Coordinates of C-alpha atoms and ligand atoms in Angstrom, one line a residue:
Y1 CA 12.5 -7.1 9.1
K2 CA 8.8 -7.5 8.5
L3 CA 7.7 -7.6 4.6
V4 CA 4.1 -6.0 4.8
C5 CA 2.2 -7.2 1.3
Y6 CA -1.2 -5.7 0.1
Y7 CA -3.8 -8.1 -1.9
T8 CA -6.3 -6.2 -3.3
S9 CA -9.4 -8.0 -3.7
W10 CA -10.6 -6.9 -7.2
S11 CA -7.4 -7.9 -8.9
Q12 CA -9.4 -11.2 -9.2
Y13 CA -11.6 -9.5 -12.1
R14 CA -8.5 -8.6 -14.7
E15 CA -8.5 -10.5 -17.5
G16 CA -6.6 -13.4 -18.3
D17 CA -3.3 -13.7 -16.6
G18 CA -4.2 -10.6 -14.9
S19 CA -6.8 -12.2 -12.6
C20 CA -5.5 -12.7 -9.3
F21 CA -6.7 -15.0 -6.1
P22 CA -5.0 -14.9 -2.8
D23 CA -4.6 -18.9 -3.6
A24 CA -2.0 -17.3 -6.2
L25 CA 0.3 -15.8 -3.8
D26 CA 2.9 -17.2 -2.2
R27 CA 3.0 -17.8 1.6
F28 CA 6.9 -17.6 2.0
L29 CA 7.1 -14.3 0.2
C30 CA 6.0 -11.9 2.5
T31 CA 5.6 -11.7 6.9
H32 CA 2.5 -10.0 6.5
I33 CA -0.3 -10.3 3.7
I34 CA -3.1 -7.8 4.2
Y35 CA -6.4 -8.3 2.3
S36 CA -7.9 -4.8 0.7
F37 CA -10.8 -3.7 1.0
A38 CA -13.1 -4.4 3.8
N39 CA -16.5 -2.3 3.8
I40 CA -18.3 -0.8 7.0
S41 CA -22.5 -1.3 6.9
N42 CA -24.4 -0.4 9.8
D43 CA -21.2 0.3 11.6
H44 CA -20.0 -3.0 11.7
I45 CA -16.7 -4.0 9.8
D46 CA -18.5 -6.3 6.8
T47 CA -17.2 -7.6 3.5
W48 CA -16.8 -5.9 0.2
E49 CA -16.5 -8.1 -2.7
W50 CA -19.4 -10.7 -3.3
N51 CA -16.7 -13.5 -2.6
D52 CA -14.9 -12.2 0.1
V53 CA -15.6 -14.7 2.8
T54 CA -14.2 -17.4 -0.1
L55 CA -10.7 -15.2 -0.9
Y56 CA -10.4 -14.6 2.9
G57 CA -10.0 -18.5 3.5
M58 CA -8.3 -18.7 0.4
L59 CA -5.7 -16.4 1.5
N60 CA -5.7 -17.8 5.4
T61 CA -5.0 -21.5 3.8
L62 CA -1.6 -20.0 3.2
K63 CA -1.0 -19.9 7.2
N64 CA -1.3 -23.3 7.3
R65 CA 2.2 -24.8 5.8
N66 CA 3.6 -21.3 7.0
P67 CA 2.5 -20.6 10.6
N68 CA 4.8 -17.4 10.9
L69 CA 2.6 -15.5 7.8
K70 CA 0.2 -13.1 9.5
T71 CA -2.8 -12.0 7.9
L72 CA -4.7 -8.4 8.5
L73 CA -7.9 -7.2 7.1
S74 CA -7.9 -4.0 5.7
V75 CA -10.7 -1.8 6.1
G76 CA -11.1 1.4 4.3
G77 CA -9.8 2.2 0.5
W78 CA -10.2 4.7 -1.9
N79 CA -13.9 4.0 -2.8
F80 CA -14.6 3.9 0.6
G81 CA -15.3 7.9 0.7
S82 CA -13.4 9.6 3.5
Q83 CA -16.9 11.0 4.5
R84 CA -18.4 7.6 5.4
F85 CA -15.5 6.8 7.5
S86 CA -15.5 10.3 8.9
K87 CA -19.1 9.9 10.1
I88 CA -18.5 6.7 11.7
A89 CA -15.2 7.8 13.2
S90 CA -16.7 11.1 14.2
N91 CA -20.2 9.9 16.0
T92 CA -19.3 8.1 19.2
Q93 CA -22.0 5.2 19.1
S94 CA -20.6 4.7 15.3
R95 CA -17.0 4.8 16.5
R96 CA -17.9 1.9 19.3
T97 CA -20.3 -0.5 17.2
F98 CA -17.2 -0.7 14.4
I99 CA -14.4 -1.1 16.5
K100 CA -16.5 -3.8 18.7
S101 CA -17.4 -5.7 15.2
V102 CA -13.8 -6.1 14.4
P103 CA -12.4 -8.7 16.6
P104 CA -15.1 -11.2 15.9
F105 CA -15.0 -10.7 12.2
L106 CA -11.3 -11.3 12.5
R107 CA -11.3 -14.4 14.4
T108 CA -14.3 -15.7 12.6
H109 CA -12.5 -15.2 9.6
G110 CA -9.1 -16.1 10.4
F111 CA -7.4 -12.9 10.4
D112 CA -4.3 -12.3 12.6
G113 CA -5.0 -8.3 12.9
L114 CA -6.9 -5.1 11.2
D115 CA -5.3 -2.5 8.8
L116 CA -6.9 1.0 9.0
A117 CA -7.0 2.0 5.1
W118 CA -8.7 5.6 6.0
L119 CA -7.9 7.3 2.6
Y120 CA -7.6 9.8 4.0
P121 CA -8.9 11.8 7.3
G122 CA -9.8 15.4 6.4
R123 CA -8.3 18.3 8.2
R124 CA -11.2 17.8 10.6
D125 CA -10.8 14.2 11.4
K126 CA -7.3 14.3 12.8
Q127 CA -8.8 13.6 16.5
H128 CA -11.2 11.5 15.2
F129 CA -8.3 9.0 13.5
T130 CA -6.2 9.5 16.9
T131 CA -9.4 8.2 19.1
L132 CA -10.3 5.6 16.3
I133 CA -6.7 4.4 17.0
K134 CA -6.6 4.4 20.2
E135 CA -10.1 2.5 21.0
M136 CA -9.5 0.0 17.9
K137 CA -6.2 -1.0 20.1
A138 CA -8.1 -0.7 23.1
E139 CA -10.6 -3.3 21.8
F140 CA -7.8 -5.6 20.6
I141 CA -6.3 -6.1 23.7
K142 CA -9.3 -6.4 26.0
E143 CA -10.4 -9.2 23.5
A144 CA -7.1 -10.8 24.2
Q145 CA -6.9 -10.2 28.2
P146 CA -7.7 -13.6 29.1
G147 CA -4.4 -15.1 26.8
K148 CA -5.0 -15.0 22.5
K149 CA -2.6 -14.0 20.7
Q150 CA -3.4 -10.0 20.4
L151 CA -4.9 -8.9 16.8
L152 CA -2.5 -6.6 14.7
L153 CA -3.5 -2.9 14.5
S154 CA -2.0 -1.2 11.6
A155 CA -2.7 1.7 9.5
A156 CA -1.9 2.8 5.8
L157 CA -1.0 6.3 6.0
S158 CA -0.3 9.0 3.2
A159 CA 3.4 9.9 2.5
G160 CA 2.7 13.3 1.3
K161 CA 3.2 16.2 3.7
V162 CA 0.0 18.1 2.9
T163 CA -2.1 15.0 4.5
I164 CA 0.3 14.1 7.0
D165 CA -0.1 17.6 8.4
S166 CA -3.8 18.0 8.1
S167 CA -4.6 14.7 9.1
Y168 CA -2.5 12.5 11.1
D169 CA -0.9 13.3 14.7
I170 CA 2.0 10.7 14.3
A171 CA 3.2 10.9 17.6
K172 CA 0.3 9.6 19.4
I173 CA -1.2 7.2 16.6
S174 CA 2.5 5.8 16.7
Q175 CA 2.2 4.4 20.4
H176 CA -1.1 2.6 19.5
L177 CA -0.2 1.2 16.0
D178 CA 2.2 -1.9 15.5
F179 CA 3.1 -0.6 12.7
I180 CA 2.2 1.8 10.2
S181 CA 2.6 1.7 6.3
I182 CA 4.0 4.9 5.2
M183 CA 2.6 5.2 1.4
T184 CA 5.8 6.3 0.0
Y185 CA 4.4 6.3 -3.7
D186 CA 2.2 8.0 -5.8
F187 CA 4.2 11.5 -5.6
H188 CA 3.7 12.9 -9.0
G189 CA 0.6 12.8 -10.6
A190 CA -0.3 13.6 -14.3
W191 CA -2.2 16.6 -13.2
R192 CA 1.4 18.3 -12.9
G193 CA 1.3 18.2 -16.4
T194 CA 4.9 16.7 -16.7
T195 CA 6.7 13.6 -16.1
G196 CA 8.0 12.7 -12.9
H197 CA 9.0 9.7 -11.1
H198 CA 6.0 8.9 -8.6
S199 CA 8.2 6.7 -6.4
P200 CA 11.7 8.5 -6.0
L201 CA 13.9 7.5 -2.8
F202 CA 15.2 11.0 -2.8
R203 CA 14.2 14.4 -4.0
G204 CA 17.0 14.2 -6.7
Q205 CA 18.1 16.9 -8.9
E206 CA 17.2 20.0 -7.2
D207 CA 16.1 21.9 -10.2
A208 CA 13.9 19.1 -11.5
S209 CA 11.7 18.5 -8.5
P210 CA 8.2 20.3 -8.2
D211 CA 8.2 19.8 -4.1
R212 CA 10.6 19.4 -1.9
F213 CA 8.8 16.6 -0.3
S214 CA 7.3 14.4 -3.0
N215 CA 10.0 11.5 -2.5
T216 CA 10.5 8.3 -0.3
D217 CA 13.1 10.1 1.7
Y218 CA 11.7 13.2 2.9
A219 CA 8.6 11.1 3.8
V220 CA 10.4 8.5 6.2
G221 CA 12.7 10.9 7.6
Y222 CA 9.5 13.6 8.4
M223 CA 7.5 10.8 9.6
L224 CA 10.3 9.7 11.9
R225 CA 10.5 13.4 12.9
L226 CA 7.1 13.4 13.8
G227 CA 7.4 10.6 16.4
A228 CA 7.1 7.5 14.4
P229 CA 9.3 5.5 15.7
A230 CA 11.6 3.7 13.2
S231 CA 11.2 0.2 14.7
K232 CA 7.1 0.6 14.2
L233 CA 7.6 2.1 10.3
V234 CA 7.4 -0.1 7.4
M235 CA 8.1 2.1 4.2
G236 CA 5.9 1.5 0.9
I237 CA 7.6 0.2 -2.2
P238 CA 5.2 0.3 -5.1
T239 CA 5.4 -2.7 -7.7
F240 CA 3.2 -0.7 -10.3
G241 CA 4.0 2.4 -12.2
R242 CA 2.8 5.5 -13.1
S243 CA 2.2 6.5 -16.4
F244 CA 2.2 9.4 -18.8
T245 CA 1.2 10.5 -22.5
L246 CA 4.2 12.5 -23.5
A247 CA 3.3 15.7 -25.4
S248 CA 6.7 16.1 -27.4
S249 CA 10.1 14.2 -28.5
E250 CA 11.3 14.8 -24.9
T251 CA 11.3 11.9 -22.2
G252 CA 13.1 13.2 -20.1
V253 CA 12.0 13.8 -15.9
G254 CA 9.6 16.8 -16.1
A255 CA 8.8 16.3 -19.9
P256 CA 5.5 17.8 -21.4
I257 CA 2.3 15.5 -21.2
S258 CA -0.9 15.5 -22.7
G259 CA -2.2 13.3 -20.0
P260 CA -2.1 10.0 -17.9
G261 CA -0.6 6.9 -20.1
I262 CA -2.3 4.3 -21.8
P263 CA -4.1 2.0 -19.8
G264 CA -2.2 -0.9 -19.3
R265 CA -3.7 -4.3 -20.8
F266 CA -4.7 -6.2 -17.7
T267 CA -5.1 -3.2 -15.4
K268 CA -7.3 -1.5 -17.6
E269 CA -6.6 2.2 -15.7
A270 CA -4.6 5.4 -17.4
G271 CA -1.7 6.3 -15.8
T272 CA -0.9 2.9 -14.1
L273 CA 0.8 0.1 -15.2
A274 CA 1.2 -3.4 -13.1
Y275 CA 4.9 -4.2 -12.8
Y276 CA 4.0 -7.2 -15.4
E277 CA 2.5 -4.8 -18.2
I278 CA 5.7 -2.7 -17.8
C279 CA 7.8 -5.6 -18.3
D280 CA 6.0 -6.0 -21.9
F281 CA 6.5 -2.4 -22.2
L282 CA 10.0 -2.5 -21.6
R283 CA 10.1 -4.8 -24.6
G284 CA 11.6 -2.4 -27.3
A285 CA 11.5 0.6 -24.8
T286 CA 14.2 2.5 -23.1
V287 CA 14.9 2.6 -19.5
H288 CA 16.6 5.7 -17.6
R289 CA 18.0 5.4 -14.1
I290 CA 17.4 9.0 -12.3
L291 CA 20.0 9.8 -10.6
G292 CA 19.3 11.3 -7.4
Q293 CA 16.1 9.2 -7.3
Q294 CA 17.8 6.3 -7.2
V295 CA 14.7 4.8 -9.6
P296 CA 14.2 4.4 -13.3
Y297 CA 11.3 5.3 -15.7
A298 CA 10.8 3.7 -19.2
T299 CA 9.8 5.7 -22.5
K300 CA 8.7 4.5 -25.8
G301 CA 6.7 6.3 -28.2
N302 CA 4.5 8.7 -26.5
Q303 CA 4.5 6.8 -23.3
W304 CA 6.2 7.4 -20.1
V305 CA 6.1 5.1 -16.7
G306 CA 7.9 5.5 -13.7
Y307 CA 8.3 2.5 -11.9
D308 CA 10.3 0.2 -9.6
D309 CA 12.3 -2.3 -10.5
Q310 CA 14.7 -4.7 -8.8
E311 CA 17.6 -2.6 -8.8
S312 CA 15.7 0.3 -7.2
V313 CA 13.9 -1.9 -4.9
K314 CA 16.9 -3.2 -3.6
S315 CA 18.4 0.2 -3.2
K316 CA 15.0 1.4 -1.1
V317 CA 15.6 -1.7 1.1
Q318 CA 19.3 -0.4 2.1
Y319 CA 17.9 3.1 2.9
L320 CA 15.1 1.5 5.0
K321 CA 17.5 -0.9 6.8
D322 CA 20.3 2.0 7.1
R323 CA 17.3 4.2 8.6
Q324 CA 16.5 0.9 10.7
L325 CA 12.6 1.0 9.8
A326 CA 10.3 -2.2 10.7
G327 CA 10.8 -3.1 7.0
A328 CA 9.0 -2.5 3.6
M329 CA 5.3 -2.5 2.5
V330 CA 4.4 -3.7 -1.1
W331 CA 1.6 -2.1 -3.0
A332 CA 0.6 -4.9 -4.4
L333 CA 1.3 -8.5 -4.7
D334 CA -1.1 -8.5 -7.4
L335 CA 0.8 -6.1 -9.4
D336 CA 4.1 -7.8 -9.5
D337 CA 4.7 -10.2 -11.7
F338 CA 2.9 -12.9 -9.5
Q339 CA 2.7 -15.1 -12.6
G340 CA 6.1 -15.0 -13.3
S341 CA 5.6 -15.0 -17.0
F342 CA 5.7 -11.7 -18.3
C343 CA 9.2 -10.7 -16.9
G344 CA 10.7 -13.6 -17.8
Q345 CA 13.3 -15.6 -16.0
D346 CA 10.0 -17.6 -14.6
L347 CA 10.6 -15.8 -11.4
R348 CA 7.4 -15.1 -9.2
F349 CA 6.8 -12.1 -7.6
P350 CA 10.4 -10.7 -9.1
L351 CA 10.0 -7.1 -7.4
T352 CA 8.4 -8.6 -3.7
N353 CA 11.3 -11.3 -3.9
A354 CA 14.0 -8.9 -4.7
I355 CA 12.6 -7.2 -1.6
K356 CA 12.9 -10.1 0.6
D357 CA 16.7 -11.0 -0.4
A358 CA 17.6 -7.5 -0.1
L359 CA 15.9 -7.5 3.7
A360 CA 17.5 -10.6 4.4
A361 CA 20.6 -10.0 2.5
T362 CA 24.1 -8.8 4.6
Ligands
LIG1 C1 -20.4 -0.5 2.4 O1 -21.5 0.1 2.8 C2 -21.9 1.1 2.6 C3 -22.9 1.7 3.6 O2 -24.2 0.4 4.3 C4 -23.0 0.8 1.3 O3 -23.5 1.7 0.9 C5 -24.9 1.7 0.5 O4 -25.7 1.5 -0.7 C6 -27.1 1.3 -1.0 C7 -27.2 0.9 -2.2 O5 -25.6 0.7 -2.9 C8 -27.5 2.6 -0.7 O6 -29.1 2.7 -0.8 C9 -27.4 3.1 0.7 O7 -28.0 4.4 1.1 C10 -25.8 3.2 1.1 N1 -25.6 3.3 2.4 C11 -24.4 4.5 2.9 C12 -24.3 4.3 4.2 O8 -23.8 5.1 1.9 C13 -22.2 0.4 0.2 O9 -22.9 -0.6 -1.0 C14 -21.2 -0.9 0.6 N2 -20.2 -1.3 -0.3 C15 -19.9 -2.6 -0.4 C16 -19.1 -3.1 -1.7 O10 -20.6 -3.4 0.5

């Protein structure tokens, strides 16, 4: 199957062993490595980080020893502002300028395709988003009409029902996109005020869940039913967990919280912990397997973190294989123990490799 992995340019800035550059990625680990994110200035796909061009090369160099490794550049991101993206896609001239600027930029920097990370189209952008995808694929087909291996077009889509209903025309965009990575995580935010695994495989205990849709299973199925071909659907598996600060002695799912979890030493962001940061957290912590959800959560002191580990990701892969999906999508390589020094076993990319093995197994 496909193993789409994201590399986030900003992961380079993390202190010490946290810092991650494309040259630190196992070229054989994934089938597709997506660089995040590229900006859009003057309606042209442009770099984001000062050293993007350098990192671009650093990444694509991984293709030398591995011809089969495809690489995509992801335009969009959360810091992009769906507003700017809305305008660019709304305006017809602006849309063309951008679409046209992509093929060159990709070929110029060694990318095998483009990933649309519009996070996220508004209720008013459903059509614009369909168009943008349709015309972007048009251009990629054109730019390769002569005989070039056509540039790939993918899109990172929300796994949340609400967003899916208001922003995506799954049926349509699924024809034009080569594959869609369904961001099946971040289902439970600190804002809810209770502990909850952010990336459950299934809904789990009926009483214990807030939404009937805040779980991987529902999203995957919802999308399928909405017209997304299973063969074009890549299921997102996070290598990071969402943390919470407990507010009482209760440590189970649905326990009271005072807010996000204490920021991780390297990711410096409340409510988030890279799997490697989690491996340190597990030291002295207690791991609980959430029955029905197939995912673990660890708690220690006033901290609670729901995450994915070797076992859970293996289960998620079975789920997706049993669903006959295109494969798994990982977010992100820099969040996995890419150093292989935090979770012991000296094994680099424990989670992602677990996923790889699971996909190749049986
Ligand atoms: C991505 O592109 C946008 C648009 O060109 C950049 O935003 C401009 O930023 C300057 C100063 O930061 C402002 O004076 C302009 O008015 C902005 N233009 C727009 C359209 O908002 C943005 O800085 C770029 N980001 C990166 C990382 O390249």
